[PDB]
């Protein structure tokens, strides 16, 4: 009582493993699909398929499909767009799509935006990446002419300092936007709200600190340099604030660039940096409008020694700080707001980068009393290490 089962005809884009002239009781056959095609019984992908001829006249399992792998509609790229290369709406095995970032305010990182639909069902970059690319904000753009110092306080125009950030709530301080979801500031400015990031009301995009027209952001987490000690000097006075959401990048909101290896070239003694603020840490009155001042780097040895004459503490100025200031810029001109960025012009790239963070300094605006700033370049690995975990 051993008879044949209907000769197995493979589905399109599939084949039968053991090709026998006839199949009878107990015998078997499997179906394997071409590369880029998958076994489907209905809408269910199978690990594999193997039908066995029973005592009946029929096979125990019906023929499955060998259907092309579909990577599905490509995800939306934030601050970017997608283009179908192979053809409109085509998302199956070996189809090609091409991501692009918005033209002037974003640049593409992580790869060139080209993804192919692979056999595993994932859109895959040339580097083998199965995640979306990232549209990073272009940094260091400004509306200013140059570093053409026009002595003393000046009024900021729209787009002059698009990285400028105002930090309200528990503290009153400043910062600078990095990328579209980080804010660089001084540790002394936000140390007390280290265990309470929510209480940091973060605002940007506005020249006027009292304007109802600003862009709002909220801190997710605050990262104090572990080397900063609150009740013992300003060494390692640097902190990062993570924003809960990314901010829109336009003419009024653009991050400052981080200083690259060769940034020391443009921050030598007598090189000109710019500090901006409302006067949050000076005295008397706050400015309604954003102000700035062009100030030269002061010889470190001259500044070290200036802050050692009596009555003063020693070890005040460390290798983790730089000094800048004018030798006679009354009131209007001074250090800046606590946490604010001291910026410089990379002349090769025409991009502004942050070189200092307003940290501390004398009360008497400045001669012989310069501002002291956290030397940002010493902390690049510290900054890179935190921003890479997010």
Looking at domain 1-68, its CATH class is mainly beta
What is the separation of C-alpha 213 from the centre of its chain, rounded to a whole number of angstroms? Answer: 25
Q: How far apart are CA 279 and CA 334, in angstroms?
A: 8
**Alpha-carbon distance 138 to 114, whole Å?**
21
Q: Could you write out the DSSP letters of every residue in 93-136?
A: TT-EEEEEE-TTTEEEESS-SEEEE-TTS-EEETT---S--EEE
Which residues are CB-neighbours of 275 under 8 A, at least 6 positions away? 292, 293, 295, 324, 334, 335, 336, 340, 341, 342, 343, 358, 371
The structure tokens 């310069």 sit at 370
Rounded distance between C-alpha atoms, residue 327 and residue 342, angstroms: 18
- Exposure string for 192-205, b = 16+ CB within 10 A, e = fewer: ebeeebeebebbbb
Helix (H) or strand (E) holding 341: strand 341-346
Domain at 69-144: CATH code: 2.10.70.10
Q: Which two tokens stand for residue 56?
A: 């009946």
Residue 382 DSSP code: H
**Per this entry, what is the length of the chain?**
390
Report the alpha-carbon distance of residue 140 to residue 64 in Å, rounded.
58
- Number of CB atoms found within 10 A of residue 101's CB: 22
Resolution in A: 2.2
CA–CA gap between residue 94 and residue 374 (Å, rounded)? 51
In a 13 Å sphere around the CA of 215, the CA atoms on its Cβ side amount to 22
Q: Residue 126 half-sphere exposure, CB side, CA atoms within 13 Å?
A: 8
Q: What is the CATH number of domain 162-255+376-390?
A: 2.40.10.10
Sequence-ordered list of residues with C-beta below 8 angstroms from that of 306, at least 6 positions apart, any chain: 368, 369, 370
d(CA 333, CA 154): 9
Q: Do domains 69-144 and 145-161+256-375 have the same CATH topology?
A: no
First-residue to last-residue Cα distance in the chain: 68
CB 298 within 8 A of CB 326: no
d(CA 197, CA 76): 30
3-state secondary structure of 91: coil
**Enclosing H/E stretch for 187:** helix 187-190
What is the Cα–Cα distance from 162 to 175, expressed in whole angstroms?
11
Phi, psi of 372 (to 5 degrees): -115, 135
Residue 32 per-residue DSSP state: E
Using an 8 Å Cβ cutoff, are 297 and 324 in contact? yes
Cα–Cα distances (Å) from 94 to 73, 75, 86, 124, in that order, read 14, 17, 9, 10
* φ, ψ dihedrals at 8, nearest 5°: -75, 115
Dihedral pair phi/psi, residue 27, rounded to 5°: -65, 175
Say how many C-beta atoms besides its own lie within 10 A of residue 170's C-beta. 14
Q: Token pair for residue 155?
A: 């009024």
Nearest to 188 by CA among 361, 15, 322, 309: 361
Query: Are 249 and 178 spatial neighbours (Cβ–Cβ below 8 Å)?
Result: no
Q: Which residue matches tokens 């053409």?
A: 148
Please state which architecture CATH assigns to domain 145-161+256-375: Beta Barrel (2.40)
- Residue 152 CA to residue 147 CA, distance in Å, equals 13
Give yes or no for a contact between 177 and 253, defined as CB atoms under 8 angstroms apart. yes
Experimental method: X-ray
Q: Are 71 and 94 in contact (CB under 8 A)?
A: no
The answer to whether residues 254 and 137 touch, using CB atoms and an 8 Å cutoff, is yes
Contacts 24+ apart (CB under 8 A), 248-251: 248/180, 248/215, 249/79, 249/105, 249/106, 249/137, 249/138, 249/180, 250/105, 251/143, 251/158, 251/159, 251/162
* Residue appearing with tokens 């729209």: 158
Cβ burial, residue 57 (10 Å; 0-12/13-18/19+): exposed
User: Are the C-beta atoms of 84 and 99 separated by less than 8 Å?
Assistant: no
Task: With CA atoms as reference, report the closest residue to 373 among 388, 387, 355.
Answer: 355
Phi and psi angles of residue 379, each rounded to the nearest 5 degrees, phi first:
-115, 15
Q: Cα–Cα distances in Å, from 231 out to 35, 41, 237?
A: 66, 69, 12
Phi and psi at 298, nearest 5°, equal -105, 135
Which are the catalytic amino acids?
188, 237, 338
The beta-carbon contacts of 380-388 under 8 Å, at least 24 apart in sequence, are 380/258, 380/259, 382/225, 382/238, 383/178, 383/184, 383/240, 383/258, 386/223, 386/240, 387/178, 387/179, 387/182, 387/240
For the chain, the helix, strand and coil percentages under 3-state DSSP, each to the nearest 5:
10, 35, 55
Rounded distance, CA 278 to CA 206, Å? 12
| DSSP H helix total and E strand total for the chain | 3, 25
| Calpha distance 44→42 (Å, rounded) | 5
- CA 376 to chain centroid, in Å, comes to 17
> How many Å apart are CA 329 and CA 308, to the nearest integer?
23
Domain definitions of the chain by residue range:
1-68, 69-144, 145-161+256-375, 162-255+376-390
Whether residue 311 is preceded by a cis peptide bond, meaning omega within 30 degrees of 0, is yes
Structure tokens at 37: 């095609």
Residue 40 exposed, middle or buried by CB count within 10 Å (0-12, 13-18, 19+): middle
Place of tokens 């983790």: 320
Measured between alpha carbons, how far is 178 from 173 in angstroms, rounded to an integer? 16
> Which tokens sit at 237?
């006075």
- If you write DSSP's letter for every residue of 245-301 in order, what string do you get? SPPPPBTTB-PPBPP-GGGGGGSSTT-EEEEEES-TTSSS---SB-EEEEEEEE-HH
Q: Give dist(CA 100, CA 80) in Å, integer.
A: 6
Widest pairwise Cα distance in the chain: 113
């Amino acid at each position: 009582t051993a008879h044949a089962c209907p000769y197995p005809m493979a589905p399109p884009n599939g084949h039968v493993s053991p090709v026998q002239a006839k199949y009878i009781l107990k015998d078997s056959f499997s179906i394997f699909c071409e590369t880029g095609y998958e076994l489907l019984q209905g809408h269910l992908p199978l690990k594999s398929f193997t039908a066995v001829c029973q005592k009946d006249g029929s096979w125990d399992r019906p023929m499955p499909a060998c259907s092309i792998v579909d990577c599905g509609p490509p995800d939306d790229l934030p601050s970017g767009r997608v283009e179908y290369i192979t053809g409109p709406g085509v998302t199956t095995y070996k189809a090609v799509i091409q991501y692009s970032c918005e033209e002037t305010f974003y640049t593409m990182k992580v790869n060139d935006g080209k993804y192919v639909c692979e056999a595993d069902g994932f859109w895959t970059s040339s580097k083998g990446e199965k995640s979306l690319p990232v549209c990073e904000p272009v940094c260091g753009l400004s509306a200013r002419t140059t570093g053409g110092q026009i002595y003393g306080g000046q009024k900021a125009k729209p787009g002059d300092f698009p990285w400028q950030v105002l930090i309200l709530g528990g503290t009153t301080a400043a910062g600078a936007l990095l990328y579209d979801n980080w804010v660089l500031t001084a540790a002394h400015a936000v140390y007390e709200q280290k265990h309470d990031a929510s209480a940091l009301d973060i605002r940007m995009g506005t020249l006027k600190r009292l304007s109802p027209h600003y862009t709002q952001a909220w801190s997710e987490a605050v990262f104090i340099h572990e080397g900063y000690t609150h009740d013992a000097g300003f060494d390692n006075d640097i902190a990062l604030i993570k924003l809960n959401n990314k901010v829109v990048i336009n003419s009024n909101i653009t991050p400052i660039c981080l200083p690259r290896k060769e940034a020391e070239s443009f921050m030598r003694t007598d090189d000109i940096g710019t500090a901006s603020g409302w006067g949050l840490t000076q005295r008397g009155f706050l400015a309604r409008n954003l102000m700035y001042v062009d100030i030269p780097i002061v010889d470190h040895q001259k500044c070290t020694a200036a802050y050692e004459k009596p009555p003063y503490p020693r070890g005040s100025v460390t290798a983790n700080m730089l000094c800048a200031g004018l030798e006679s810029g009354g009131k209007d001109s001074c250090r800046g707001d606590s946490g604010g960025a001291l910026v410089f012009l990379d002349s090769e790239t025409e991009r502004w980068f942050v070189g200092g963070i307003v940290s501390w300094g004398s009360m008497n605006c400045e001669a012989g009393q310069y501002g002291v700033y956290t030397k940002v370049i010493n902390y690049i690995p510290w900054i890179e290490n935190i921003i890479s975990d997010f």
